[PDB]
């Protein structure tokens, strides 16, 4: 215990030394973006109950959405059509994933199972391709690496990297104090970050499977996490109505985003294609945009009658989709 | 300006919307019931007699309800569109735990504005427990000897006044904790139930026939 504290005092002491300047002073000369206006262009209707997750497509035109009545729907974002409507076995689902190749779709929730569905079969139906079940908590995020590799973060303090043909766990990740909330993969595909209900964020390694770093600057549990486009930073949003920008090479907190008028928690955090706008969901029937450098408000995506539970920006950055508990998806330009 | 294929695409979309509307209707005539409870509570007998996620699909008088048990600070956000909750607590054995739990559930932010049904389970073994004398319930709450039921009790059986005071003190504790806050937002419905007794279904049927009626009256501006 004394040896661990020794290091604990010393690492902190070590880190203080690394810091030389803040972010506001350097980025003063960066002119503010200003006021930003986006208007609804589509309103996707057909979900009975509140929706929890959505995920765009690689072609930037199809999307998938998951609701609490046991419904996955694949939407054509141009003509508002409904390409597919799939029923789920468990009515409580918190996450959905759309494969980079466009052949598979993934879902999961309280059922303790992750389901992989095959889209481009030789018929007009969508059937179950794989049923991964090796967890004892509720899943909160699952992401595709390829058509074979999937990383799922669960409530049983474990993050698993699987293999789909067999159906057994391949690399298990442990080290979190509370249940895992959110997860995001790096563009370089080598690493990914995770956030759990212990106010701490943790990097990992895909191949070896070890916690390489750990970041802690929050007060309460972190609900959402996402990577920066560069791959050398990320951002978190937590229940204490705050967003944090964390760095990987510097291993230190960079900047915080919060205003005295916000009291509700943050549920989804996402980045623009370039990495200049930060879209943050909320529980006060809103969805805000922050200047990721100067830490200022830059407009409001008002228009929802309930809390915003899922956010997704398209790959080429020409649209943003927002879901809510009022069961209406809104597309903004 | 639609091609020969866009027309069929839109026809397929409309054929899907039909089915979606068919499902939305049936989704409005169903009432959902979250089932909380403690470890040793006799929920198993109740869910057997009405029949991770543990489900119940019982129906009564041409109306269908769906009961679900879970397994708490994290997944309570999901369960706020339910009609009501059938809370089960143990009675005929030592309670300070259970009261605590009731007091935390009754004040939850995502569980406000929802009425609570409250089964006091296993009374059958409370009749004997006080029949054996010794120290039944008074050692933990030194107020059973000092609490007296009024004349409005109207016991169903009246087999023993002692068990009547024993029942009514704990019922008063729960009712007090229910009415000590909430601004008339929701209401507790207590019952005395056992394991053996047949119908805790009608009771649930007659309940939540009052809650929706009350809501109805408040909307139509006459309450």
């Amino acid at each position: 215990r004394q040896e661990a504290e020794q290091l604990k005092n010393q690492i902190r002491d070590a880190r203080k030394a690394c810091a030389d300047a803040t972010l506001s002073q350097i980025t003063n000369n960066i002119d503010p973006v200003g006021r930003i206006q986006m208007r609804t262009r589509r309103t996707l209707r057909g979900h009975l109950a509140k929706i929890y997750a959505m995920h765009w497509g690689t072609d930037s035109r199809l999307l998938v959405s998951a609701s609490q009545d046991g419904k996955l729907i694949i939407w054509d974002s141009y003509t508002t059509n409904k390409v597919h409507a799939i029923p789920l076995r468990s009515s409580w689902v918190m996450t959905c994933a759309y494969a980079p190749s466009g052949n598979y779709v993934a879902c999961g929730g309280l059922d303790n199972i992750c389901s992989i569905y095959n889209l481009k079969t030789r018929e007009g139906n969508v059937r179950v391709s794989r049923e991964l079940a090796g967890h004892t908590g509720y899943l909160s995020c699952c992401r595709f690496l390829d058509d074979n590799q999937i990383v799922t973060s669960s409530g049983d303090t474990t993050c698993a990297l699987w293999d789909i043909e067999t159906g057994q766990q391949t690399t298990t990740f442990t080290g979190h104090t509370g249940d895992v909330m959110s997860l995001s993969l790096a563009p370089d595909t080598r690493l990914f970050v995770s956030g759990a209900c212990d106010a701490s964020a943790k990097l990992w390694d895909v191949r070896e499977g070890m916690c390489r770093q750990t970041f802690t600057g929050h007060e309460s549990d972190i609900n959402a996490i996402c990577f920066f486009p560069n791959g050398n930073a990320f951002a978190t949003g937590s229940d204490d109505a705050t967003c944090r920008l964390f760095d990987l090479r510097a291993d230190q907190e960079l900047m915080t985003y919060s205003h005295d008028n916000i009291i509700c928690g943050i549920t989804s955090v996402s980045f623009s294609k370039s990495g200049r706008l930060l879209l943050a969901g909320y529980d006060d029937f809103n969805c805000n945009v922050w200047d990721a450098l100067k830490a200022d408000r830059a407009g409001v995506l008002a228009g929802h009658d309930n809390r915003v539970s899922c956010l997704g920006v398209t790959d080429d950055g020409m649209a943003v989709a927002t879901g809510s508990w009022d069961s209406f998806l809104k597309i903004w330009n | 300006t639609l091609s020969a294929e866009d027309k069929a695409a839109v026809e397929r979309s409309k054929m899907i919307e039909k089915q979606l509307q068919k499902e939305r209707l049936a989704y409005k005539a169903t009432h959902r019931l979250l089932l909380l409870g403690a470890d040793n509570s006799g929920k198993s007998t109740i869910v057997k007699q009405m029949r991770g996620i543990f489900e119940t699909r019982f129906q009564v008088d041409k109306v269908n309800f769906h009961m679900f048990d879970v397994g708490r600070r994290k997944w309570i956000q999901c369960f706020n569109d339910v009609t009501a909750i059938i809370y089960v607590a143990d009675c005929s054995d030592y309670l300070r735990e259970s009261l605590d739990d009731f007091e935390s559930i009754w004040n939850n932010r995502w569980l406000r504005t929802i009425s609570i049904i409250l089964f006091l389970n296993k009374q059958d073994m409370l009749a004997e427990k006080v029949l054996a004398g010794k120290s039944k319930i008074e050692d933990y709450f030194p107020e059973y000897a000092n609490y007296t039921v009024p004349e409005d009790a109207t016991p169903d059986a009246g087999e023993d006044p002692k068990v009547t005071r024993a029942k009514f003190f704990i019922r008063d504790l729960f009712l007090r904790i229910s009415t000590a806050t909430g601004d008339g937002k929701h209401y507790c419905y207590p019952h005395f139930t056992c394991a053996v007794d047949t119908e805790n279904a009608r009771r649930i049927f007659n309940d939540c026939r009052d809650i929706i009626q009350r809501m109805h009256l408040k909307q139509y501006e006459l309450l």
Partner: single-chain antibody, 233 residues
Framework: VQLVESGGGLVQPGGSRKLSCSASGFAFSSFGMHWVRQAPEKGLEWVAYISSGSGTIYYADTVKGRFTISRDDPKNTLFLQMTSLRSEDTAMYYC??????????????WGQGTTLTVSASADIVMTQATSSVPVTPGESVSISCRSSKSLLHSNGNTYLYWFLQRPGQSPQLLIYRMSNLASGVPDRFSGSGSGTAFTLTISRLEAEDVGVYYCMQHLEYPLTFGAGTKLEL
């Protein structure tokens, strides 16, 4: 996936017939269906079309009011009734299936077909340039086709289909919308165009590339196949 036809034979003039195409191996109710006929020594022509849910029906201008088409999803089989058999009504028929959503592949499967013999208009025109081409293994083929009107739409879609019929088999889909490969076809084939002049290019030639090549359009619903082009080794 298997579509099998029933009916056909020798009939007297002026009679009536009923042909039934039965499907077993795929989800019938999500698919639209067509009938396509072929003359004893000529190309292919379109006869009818029924949608999914029976909410839209089309016929050919030739037989606009003499044939009827209907399906039984619970029985899982489609059929047509044929009346007032002319002298042109002698042919051999196939039932084709298709599906329409964003990115699908219509006309992706053909039936076996059955033969019917009888005893004793502003539509797009496709022109097949060369009616016969001599080829040898391991060289390139450059089949061409010409269209009366530009087939490209405002969005960008093209609606050109390439079919290849072997001697003794039904046609198979190779390219849909002028640029997309089919599922089970090799990467040897390629297709291109500029709205009116369409080209199918083969780089390496094998022994199974022998047959007749047909084109097709899907812009305006009365849809015409084309004469074809024969390849021999």
């Amino acid at each position: 996936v298997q579509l099998v036809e029933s009916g056909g034979g020798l009939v007297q003039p002026g009679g009536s017939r009923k042909l039934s195409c039965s499907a077993s191996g795929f989800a019938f109710s999500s698919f639209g269906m067509h009938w396509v006929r072929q003359a004893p020594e000529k190309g292919l022509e379109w006869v009818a079309y029924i949608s999914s849910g029976s909410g839209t029906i089309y016929y050919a201008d030739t037989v606009k009011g003499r044939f009827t088409i209907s399906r039984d999803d619970p029985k899982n089989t489609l059929f047509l009734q044929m009346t007032s058999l002319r002298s042109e009504d002698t042919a051999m028929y196939y039932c084709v299936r298709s599906i329409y959503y964003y990115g699908s592949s219509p006309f992706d499967f053909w039936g076996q077909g059955t033969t019917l013999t009888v005893s004793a208009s502003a539509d797009i025109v496709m022109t097949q340039a060369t009616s016969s081409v001599p080829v040898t293994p391991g060289e390139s083929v450059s089949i061409s086709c010409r269209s009366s009107k530009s087939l490209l739409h405002s969005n960008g879609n093209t609606y050109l289909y390439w079919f290849l019929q072997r001697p003794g088999q039904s046609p198979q889909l190779l390219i849909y919308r002028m640029s997309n490969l089919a599922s089970g076809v090799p990467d040897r084939f390629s297709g291109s165009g500029s709205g009116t002049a369409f080209t199918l290019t083969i780089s390496r030639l094998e022994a199974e590339d022998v047959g007749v090549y047909y084109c097709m359009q899907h812009l305006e619903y009365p849809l015409t196949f084309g004469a074809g082009t024969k390849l021999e080794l």
